[PDB]
Amino acid sequence: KMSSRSGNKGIAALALPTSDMPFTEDGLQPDLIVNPHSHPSRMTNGQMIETTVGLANALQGVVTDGTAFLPINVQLLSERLAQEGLRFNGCQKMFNGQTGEYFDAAIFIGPTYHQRLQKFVLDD
Amino acid sequence: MLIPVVCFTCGFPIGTYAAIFDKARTEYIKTKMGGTLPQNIPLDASLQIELKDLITALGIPMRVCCRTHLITTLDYRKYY
Amino acid sequence: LKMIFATQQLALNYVRNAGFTVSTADMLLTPEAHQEVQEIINELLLES
Amino acid sequence: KIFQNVEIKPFLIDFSNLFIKNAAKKLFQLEEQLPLVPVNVVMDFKGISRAAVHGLSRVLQDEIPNYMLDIKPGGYKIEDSTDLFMTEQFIRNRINFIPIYAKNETLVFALRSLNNSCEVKTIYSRDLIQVAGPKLKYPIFNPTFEIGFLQPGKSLIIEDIYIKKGIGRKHAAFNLAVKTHFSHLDIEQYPTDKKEYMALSGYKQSSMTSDPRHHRLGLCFPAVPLPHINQAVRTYLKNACRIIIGRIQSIQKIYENFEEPQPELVLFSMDEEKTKAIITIKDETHTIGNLLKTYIYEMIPDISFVGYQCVPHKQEMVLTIIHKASQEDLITLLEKSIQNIIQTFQILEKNVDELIA
Amino acid sequence: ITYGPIETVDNEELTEADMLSFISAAVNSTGLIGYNIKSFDDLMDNGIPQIVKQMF
Amino acid sequence: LENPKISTFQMNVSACAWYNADFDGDQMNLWVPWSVMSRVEAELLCSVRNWFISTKSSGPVNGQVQDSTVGSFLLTRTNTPMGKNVMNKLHAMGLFQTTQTDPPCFANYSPTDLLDGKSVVSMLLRQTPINYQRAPTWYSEVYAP
Amino acid sequence: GWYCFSWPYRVDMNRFFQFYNEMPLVKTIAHNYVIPNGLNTIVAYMIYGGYNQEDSVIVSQSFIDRGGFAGTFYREEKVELESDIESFGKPDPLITKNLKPGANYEKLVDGFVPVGTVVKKGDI
Ligand SMILES: [Mg+2]
Numbered sequence: 051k052m053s054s055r056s057g058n059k060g061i062a063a064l065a066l067p068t069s070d071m072p073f074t075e076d077g078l079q080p081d082l083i084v085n086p087h088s089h090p091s092r093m094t095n096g097q098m099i100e101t102t103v104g105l106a107n108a109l110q111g112v113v114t115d116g117t118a119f120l121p122i123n124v125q126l127l128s129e130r131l132a133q134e135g136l137r138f139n140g141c142q143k144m145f146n147g148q149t150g151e152y153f154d155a156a157i158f159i160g161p162t163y164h165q166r167l168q169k170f171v172l173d174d
Numbered sequence: 175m176l177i178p179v180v181c182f183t184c185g186f187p188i189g190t191y192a193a194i195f196d197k198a199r200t201e202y203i204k205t206k207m208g209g210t211l212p213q214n215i216p217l218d219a220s221l222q223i224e225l226k227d228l229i230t231a232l233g234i235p236m237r238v239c240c241r242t243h244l245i246t247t248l249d250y251r252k253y254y
Numbered sequence: 255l256k257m258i259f260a261t262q263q264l265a266l267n268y269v270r271n272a273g274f275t276v277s278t279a280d281m282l283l284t285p286e287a288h289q290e291v292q293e294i295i296n297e298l299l300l301e302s
Numbered sequence: 303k304i305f306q307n308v309e310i311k312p313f314l315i316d317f318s319n320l321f322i323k324n325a326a327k328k329l330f331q332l333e334e335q336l337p338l339v340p341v342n343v344v345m346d347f348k349g350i351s352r353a354a355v356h357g358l359s360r361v362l363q364d365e366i367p368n369y370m371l372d373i374k375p376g377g378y379k380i381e382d383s384t385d386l387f388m389t390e391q392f393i394r395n396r397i398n399f400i401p402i403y404a405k406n407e408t409l410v411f412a413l414r415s416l417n418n419s420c421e422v423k424t425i426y427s428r429d430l431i432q433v434a435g436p437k438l439k440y441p442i443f444n445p446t447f448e449i450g451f452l453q454p455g456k457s458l459i460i461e462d463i464y465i466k467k468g469i470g471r472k473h474a475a476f477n478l479a480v481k482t483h484f485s486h487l488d489i490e491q492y493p494t495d496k497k498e499y500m501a502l503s504g505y506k507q508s509s510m511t512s513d514p515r516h517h518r519l520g521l522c523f524p525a526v527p528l529p530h531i532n533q534a535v536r537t538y539l540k541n542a543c544r545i546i547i548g549r550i551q552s553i554q555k556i557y558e559n560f561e562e563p564q565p566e567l568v569l570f571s572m573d574e575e576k577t578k579a580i581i582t583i584k585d586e587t588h589t590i591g592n593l594l595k596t597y598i599y600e601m602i603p604d605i606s607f608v609g610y611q612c613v614p615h616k617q618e619m620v621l622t623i624i625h626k627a628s629q630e631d632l633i634t635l636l637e638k639s640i641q642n643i644i645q646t647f648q649i650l651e652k653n654v655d656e657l658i659a
Numbered sequence: 660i661t662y663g664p665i666e667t668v669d670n671e672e673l674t675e676a677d678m679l680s681f682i683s684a685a686v687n688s689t690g691l692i693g694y695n696i697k698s699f700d701d702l703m704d705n706g707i708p709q710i711v712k713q714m715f
Numbered sequence: 716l717e718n719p720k721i722s723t724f725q726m727n728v729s730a731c732a733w734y735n736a737d738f739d740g741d742q743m744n745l746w747v748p749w750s751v752m753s754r755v756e757a758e759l760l761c762s763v764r765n766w767f768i769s770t771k772s773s774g775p776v777n778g779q780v781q782d783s784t785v786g787s788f789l790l791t792r793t794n795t796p797m798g799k800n801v802m803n804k805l806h807a808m809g810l811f812q813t814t815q816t817d818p819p820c821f822a823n824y825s826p827t828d829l830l831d832g833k834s835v836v837s838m839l840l841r842q843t844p845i846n847y848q849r850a851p852t853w854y855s856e857v858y859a860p
Numbered sequence: 861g862w863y864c865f866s867w868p869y870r871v872d873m874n875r876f877f878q879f880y881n882e883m884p885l886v887k888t889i890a891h892n893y894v895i896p897n898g899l900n901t902i903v904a905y906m907i908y909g910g911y912n913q914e915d916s917v918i919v920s921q922s923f924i925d926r927g928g929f930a931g932t933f934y935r936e937e938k939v940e941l942e943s944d945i946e947s948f949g950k951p952d953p954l955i956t957k958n959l960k961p962g963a964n965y966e967k968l969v970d971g972f973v974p975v976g977t978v979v980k981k982g983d984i
């Protein structure tokens with residue numbers, strides 16, 4: 051079981067080799083693939099803002115503060131991405147690792163801090 | 175307990191520059207602050223210094239994963 | 255049950271060429287559309 | 303000439319940056335480049351399917367035989383490994399992932415470290431000593447890696463550090479190349495900075511109808527000797543081509559014995575006119591399945607069905623063909639397709655010889 | 660004590676990130692675990708002797 | 716599952732409605748009948764096809780969830796941002812290379828022929844032909860203005 | 861995470877030490893007072909074959925091999941003795957009754973298994 055800092059927890063179900071994972075035009079590939087259907091009902095919007103902000107942090111070379119109740123502006127954070135050479139939405143062109151074919155849609159990919167929960171399958 | 179030998183995500187060998195990067199980052203942040211006590215320097219203020227061009231000078235590419243793992247990894251020798 | 259499985263593989267194999275994502279920019283109102291929400295909210299606080 | 307215009311660019315340290323220069327000089331007495339550097343290779347292919355280019359990329363990533371450093375059992379000397387934080391699991395994981403460029407498996411190394419000081423001492427890869435095999439004229443790994451750190455008065459002794467062989471598909475310490483670029487040059491693109499097109503890939507054709515045949519592929523190799531970049535890159539490319547040819551020939555040797563009953567090939571006569579073939583190869587991947595399907599489809603444009611499957615929990619590749627011919631004619635077409643694959647990759651290897659000087 | 664007139668204080672450049680230093684000061688004085696050791700020090704300094712002598 | 720590194724009970728996501736389960740850490744029990752009498756009645760009486768219709772409500776229990784709901788919409792959608800929602804013969808054949816049914820016949824199709832998504836779905840629903848006519852969830856009076 | 865900095869001096873039950881930890885790219889004020897335990901994983905928010913449905917994730921096998929969320933797990937034991945009745949030592953089957961069936965006594969030296977040997981199910 052893993053989890054992000056917004057309380058979005060899940061079970062590792064599949065592990066793929068390197069040649070089987072999706073990759074972007076610049077070769078970026080994920081460590082984790084989480085389902086977009088985990089978002090709309092749980093409304094964990096701070097996890098998506100963290101991916102937006104941290105994506106520009108990594109290219110800038112900095113660690114910033116995202117404490118609760120500080121002033122935020124998702125419009126101005128999304129313009130920071132464009133200033134760094136990325137798209138406004140933080141989405142990229144991706145390819146299927148198994149066939150080599152590109153999706154007809156840009157994929158939202160970026161860094162999100164995750165945790166391993168101490169619930170081990172070998173013990174249960 | 176150290177910066178990993180390779181990037182966790184792609185496998186680029188970021189660990190051949192880890193020692194140089196750590197020392198050079200220390201020197202660079204000290205230059206940017208200008209000789210202040212380690213406790214009188216806030217943790218937040220030193221993390222806002224841009225290390226883009228230092229990492230570029232090490233020869234490490236512009237990959238999101240490699241710079242993330244080179245910049246954020248905690249060092250056990252500085253906590254124990 | 256055999257049809258649920260078969261139509262589920264058709265749908266999944268279609269999306270492995272089409273893609274489906276969600277981003278932070280999907281939940282963001284346009285600057286002029288933000289002012290329209292504020293006007294609707296002020297009308298409620300005026301009637302209140 | 304299937305692939306032209308290669309570009310090779312090593313990743314080098316910029317010593318004009320003062321902070322990097324000072325840190326390097328005072329840590330390793332390093333004023334020049336390191337013995338081994340990463341190399342970025344960008345290749346353009348023309349007149350070829352993306353099944354072939356992507357199969358080449360997949361093999362070069364994690365299906366090519368590669369080498370790593372491992373520890374033989376009992377090599378971690380518990381008796382005189384007084385340090386308690388530098389456990390065997392941690393140090394072994396550190397050592398497995400050092401990139402090496404080794405030319406024989408007879409070499410053996412050792413680590414014999416003592417902390418006879420009052421501070422924490424750092425172990426670097428320059429502290430590995432060769433204890434067996436012929437003496438190295440050139441290094442096989444860089445001397446700048448951090449392997450561990452010892453508390454005051456502690457030691458770490460590891461014997462029997464040998465060179466192991468494998469493929470990155472089984473353990474990722476045998477991975478070779480990292481992806482840096484992939485694109486098709488015969489499909490036009492939108493400007494996707496405009497907020498009108500930023501939800502789309504950028505290509506002007508759907509991937510459900512486009513058939514590109516002009517590609518650009520970029521891969522980075524992690525540790526290559528500085529005076530032999532072209533030779534190392536050439537060797538890697540040739541080995542990838544040879545690996546693919548070998549696996550296709552393994553399938554070929556199954557196809558030809560369609561008279562003798564085989565557990566890997568099944569032929570049905572579904573009707574008076576239609577024949578069905580099912581090929582099940584254990585431990586095969588999407589590389590061969592995709593290549594076989596693409597070339598069978600190019601040979602028989604009017605086929606009833608061709609498709610393959612690699613279910614993750616089955617560890618096998620199953621290829622299904624349904625065609626309106628007799629069994630002998632179907633086998634003839636299949637052999638023709640496999641020959642086309644072999645010919646394409648032989649041309650690729652000959653072009654590699656011509657291009658990289 | 661008399662405090663200076665409130666109409667001459669410069670706070671227009673106080674930001675919400677400036678206000679987190681108050682939280683920093685509060686935690687630094689208090690400590691994350693402050694009361695648990697103060698209470699035991701009082702028990703070892705003023706509670707046990709008084710409870711042994713003047714109660715039984 | 717012959718991979719020795721797997722310790723989980725695995726199932727299809729559309730079977731979770733029978734047990735009211737999901738994949739955030741739930742545990743389920745499993746026992747295998749060894750007796751002949753217990754094995755006969757497991758297969759004839761207690762198979763999960765007998766619980767496809769609810770006893771409580773008398774309606775169906777299983778169906779698509781979340782990826783096949785939105786992936787069936789994307790497949791049968793008439794227009795895509797790229798134009799018409801069509802694929803060529805190779806990609807239409809590829810949609811069926813996993814369904815574990817008998818493949819359809821594409822022999823009356825050329826490599827450059829285009830097939831709509833509704834054409835591909837019909838190749839699957841021909842085996843069990845039914846009649847259906849309603850309006851989708853997609854069409855809403857709320858969104859219409 | 862690093863559950864304590866004196867783990868090698870302790871004999872604990874069901875404790876996990878995770879080797880590698882990171883500071884979040886978007887940190888908060890709480891990371892001025894506790895050690896962060898987690899990693900800055902790259903996450904793609906997408907549909908990939910239906911294996912991340914209903915709170916599941918797809919993991920990179922390479923990420924696992926490289927030590928992402930890897931660590932060491934500990935279990936302790938405590939067996940006591942009676943005054944002059946019981947003692948520690950390798951049992952002799954001929955003069956000792958009720959030896960546990962199928963149990964491997966060949967690992968014992970001087971009553972305890974030596975440090976560094978792998979114990980299996982059924983071993984003494
Ligand atoms: Mg649950």
Ligand SMILES: [Zn+2]
Pocket residue numbers: 181182183184185186237238239240241
């Ligand atoms: Zn990387």
